[PDB]
Design a protein around this ligand. Structure first.
Ligand code: GIF
Length: 848
């Protein structure tokens, strides 16, 4: 008899991590790459993922230009050899790539399996017929090409996401074969909820077989919530496929939501029987949630009205480059969640598996975006050139173009993930102008999605709405969407809303405020696209710089807050990313190589607007807070002259979700100030400062060195939070700050250790740029160093002599250390010239 234990083992064994033991060579000879018994002594042995570009030096002559981060691409081969276990000799074998950038070719045993242009969409190949008989070694060779320029942001190059192997019986649930629907959830939620499941089953055998599917639903990390539900036994013919169906009932399921930080998730277990023998078993993640959206009230989730407090995110992880990593993406998404973010937009490409899983786990709604261009292109070597070409993937359907195939497979991949609620079929598509070609195209793409999944809003992000009054032919394209995304179009919302009263409208992309951490300039002014030499390649952490087409955090948020019919926004961006260093865009001889748009810097350190947003989006009951800016080191006349008002006072500002804030300088009160409480036209309560354009409270403070302390209080006058800033003396030491006391010894988990330049009393020196040198000992591996400074041209990776160094920027930076597969510990030591050295130790071992 097959025990539940055996079924769970079968599920685990069905899919394996195939990232280990690859060989990499830039510009490798094609014939050596694909052939048996190649000499790999000149190749780099490594474990995936591996983005080769992040290891380059910045290049002012890079064909990527600074928009692409001035890190070159080129072409490379990755090669791996493997053998099937004796028991797996007759099994079906599928190889899945979560992302390869880009224009890839996969070879198995000297033969071309497929060519796949898309740099971000997951793709997979059934490689069974290509493998050797009798368990002799197989060779996989992957060619990746990044011919530049191909991108408006840093892409990275190569196999930058996971590769997995599925080994299954000849009769099996096909790739993305599971559909899970809860069509009557709202009505049924207080009793038995019908859960409609569908399995696409394939018989790859040359014999007919009798087929039965058996299902059970379980709480993820919890218990069973159904028994086994069985389909009627039927024949599945040789080389044929079929869809089996069942309905399971789950009583009073916990509903997945963004309103908590560990939302409920479930798994469907599928057991497949061939002639009465269990041959295939798998699980599929899903959740129970429903939502609704109306023109005038916007969005609701499980009956609760919310706004999308969203961010747009690019894929890179700073010093990790394009390398996707669960722990890195977890840190980032949890950080967005700590801010009050409840949703994300994967701008402008399919998401990794890690991103999608973590969003489901943390409770973040997701818009996953297929395209940055259609047939027009934006950069010569981007996806545009492939968009209407015939798809040559071995599993593409007749007549499918690449755009059809890529969009379909993205949707089929993610259709059960409860976090995804929107599919975007394009961002700022210039050619989508309402002409016959673009109109045909929008309807074709909408239909590709609706044939797979009707439960999610098909959308686009459109900046065309910001020009003039926002009207034009593009309106016909918007009419074909479930929901219309406005990029930077607040100014035309009122008119577009009166014109199109049935549209579901939201800000697909907003703000594009530009900021450098710890840099301050002219807080009394709003600065528009201010990029003169007097700026020193920095933007203001007061949040008063924004691009020509952009808005400040305050202006973009207050508009959203005031308008119920504008359902939310996805801020450009939640974090900085490599490339696009507007407002120095493609000024290639300047130092800049990474973005200013992020609320948080590339090193994972929040800029001040993080706390502005937190004060707006996180309830005083959940996390009472107060945050002061700027720093309190104003000895430097040049720095101070750019900040001080006419009376020479420093504008000190507090963001807080409390009722009042009282500022003290060296223990002396500078006066309690109280937020003005107000209501939106539809009765929503909010707080503001001295006027509608100020969400902070402000004091003009005559500079006296010492301590500024802010006391935040509830309406009854009880202290609920404080913040404080202290004038630092001269650098005296480097201090290391551990995020984790321990991590898993799985060779995948990692940790972020911050370094700070401190004075002799342990105050961070807010202007310090001292060079820090790092040593690592023990069971760890340094994998990155960063300080988030846009103008920096420092390496993120090891120097050419193997050493690891990085300057502080405005007192701070981070070092990233990955675990090995051995338990133990690692010690990070930091040194700096004439300063005291410091070390921390992080343990490695058991997960959880
Ligand atoms: O302000 C910069 C943004 C404009 N909208 C599209 C984004 O990818 C980015 O270029």
């Amino acid at each position: 008899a097959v025990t539940n234990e055996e079924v769970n083992q079968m599920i685990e064994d069905r899919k394996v991590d195939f990232n280990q033991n690859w060989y990499f060579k830039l510009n490798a000879n094609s014939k050596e790459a694909i052939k048996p018994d190649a000499d790999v002594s000149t190749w780099k042995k490594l474990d995936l993922p591996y983005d080769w570009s992040i290891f380059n030096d910045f290049d002012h002559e890079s064909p990527a230009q600074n928009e692409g981060g001035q890190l070159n691409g080129g072409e490379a081969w990755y090669r791996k050899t493997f053998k099937l276990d004796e028991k797996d000799l007759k099994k079906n074998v599928r190889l899945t790539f979560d992302g390869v950038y880009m224009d890839s070719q996969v070879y198995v045993n000297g033969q071309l399996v497929g060519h796949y242009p898309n740099g971000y969409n997951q793709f997979s190949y059934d490689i069974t017929k290509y493998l050797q008989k009798d368990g002799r070694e197989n060779v996989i060779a992957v060619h990746a090409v990044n011919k530049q320029p191909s991108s408006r942001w840093y892409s990275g190059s190569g196999i930058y996401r996971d590769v997995t192997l599925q080994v299954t019986d000849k009769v099996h649930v096909e790739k993305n074969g599971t559909t899970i629907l809860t069509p009557k959830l709202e009505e049924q939620q207080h009793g038995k909820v019908e859960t409609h499941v569908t399995s696409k089953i394939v018989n790859t055998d040359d014999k007919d077989h009798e087929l039965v599917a058996e299902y059970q639903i379980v709480e993820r990390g919890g218990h069973a919530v159904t028994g086994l539900v069985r389909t009627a036994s039927r024949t599945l013919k040789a080389h044929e496929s079929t869809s089996l169906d069942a309905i399971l009932e789950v009583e009073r399921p916990k509903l997945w939501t963004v309103l908590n930080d560990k939302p409920a998730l479930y798994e469907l277990i599928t057991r497949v029987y061939r002639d009465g023998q269990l041959v295939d078993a798998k699980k599929d993640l899903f959740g129970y949630r429903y939502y609704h959206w109306t023109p005038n009230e916007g969005f609701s989730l499980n009956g609760e009205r919310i706004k999308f407090h969203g961010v747009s995110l690019h894929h890179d992880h700073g010093a990790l480059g394009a390398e996707e990593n669960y722990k890195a993406e977890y840190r980032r998404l949890k950080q967005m969640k700590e801010m009050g973010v409840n949703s994300i937009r994967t701008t402008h490409n399919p998401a990794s598996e890690q991103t999608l899983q973590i969003a489901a786990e943390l409770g973040l709604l997701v818009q996953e975006e297929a395209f940055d261009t259609w047939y027009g292109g934006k950069k010569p070597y981007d996806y545009g050139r492939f968009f209407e070409k015939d798809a040559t993937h071995p599993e593409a359907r007749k007549g499918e173009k690449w755009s059809d195939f890529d969009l379909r497979t993205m949707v089929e991949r993610g259709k059960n993930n409860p976090a995804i609620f929107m599919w975007s079929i394009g961002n700022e598509i210039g050619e989508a102008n309402g002409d016959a070609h673009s109109l045909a195209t929008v309807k074709r793409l909408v239909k590709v999605i609706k044939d797979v999944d009707k439960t999610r809003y098909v959308t686009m992000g459109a900046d065309k709405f910001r020009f003039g009054n926002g009207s034009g032919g593009h309106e016909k394209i918007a009419d074909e969407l479930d929901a219309v995304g406005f990029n930077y179009s607040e100014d035309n919302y009122k008119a577009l809303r009166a014109k199109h009263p049935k549209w579901l409208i939201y800000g697909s992309e907003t703000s594009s405020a530009t900021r450098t951490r710890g840099s301050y300039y002219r807080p009394e002014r709003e600065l528009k696209h201010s990029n003169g030499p007097e700026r020193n390649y920095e933007q203001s952490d007061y949040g008063n710089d924004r691009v020509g087409w952009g808005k400040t955090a305050t202006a973009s948020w207050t508009f959203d807050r005031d308008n119920a019919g504008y359902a939310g926004q996805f801020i450009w961006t939640g974090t900085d990313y490599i490339g696009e260093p507007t407002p120095w865009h493609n000024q290639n001889q300047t130092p800049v190589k990474s973005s200013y748009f992020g609320i948080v810097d590339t090193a994972g350190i929040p800029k001040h607007d993080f706390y502005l947003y937190q004060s707006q989006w996180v309830s005083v009951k959940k996390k009472p807070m107060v945050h002061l800016l700027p720093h309190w080191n104003w000895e430097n006349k040049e720095l101070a002259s750019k900040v001080a008002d006419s009376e020479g006072k420093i504008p000190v500002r507090a963001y807080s979700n409390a009722s009042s804030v009282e500022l003290f300088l060296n223990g002396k009160s500078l006066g309690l100030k109280t937020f003005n409480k107000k209501q939106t036209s539809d009765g929503r309560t909010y707080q503001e400062g001295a006027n509608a354009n100020e969400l902070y409270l402000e004091w003009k403070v005559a500079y006296q060195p010492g301590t500024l302390e802010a006391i935040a209080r509830d309406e009854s006058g009880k202290e609920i939070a404080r913040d404080k800033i202290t004038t630092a003396g001269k650098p005296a030491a480097v201090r290391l700050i551990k995020e984790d006391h321990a991590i898993a010894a799985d060779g995948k988990d990692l940790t972020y250790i911050y370094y700070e330049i401190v004075d002799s009393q342990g105050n961070v020196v807010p202007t310090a740029n001292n060079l820090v040198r790092f040593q690592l000992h023990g069971q760890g591996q340094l994998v990155g160093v960063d300080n988030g400074e846009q103008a920096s041209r420092e390496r993120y990776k090891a120097q050419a002599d193997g050493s690891w160094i990085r300057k502080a920027f405005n007192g701070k930076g981070v070092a990233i250390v990955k675990s090995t597969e051995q338990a133990g510990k690692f010690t990070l030591t930091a040194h700096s010239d004439l300063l005291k050295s410091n070390q921390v130790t992080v343990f490695t071992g058991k997960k959880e």
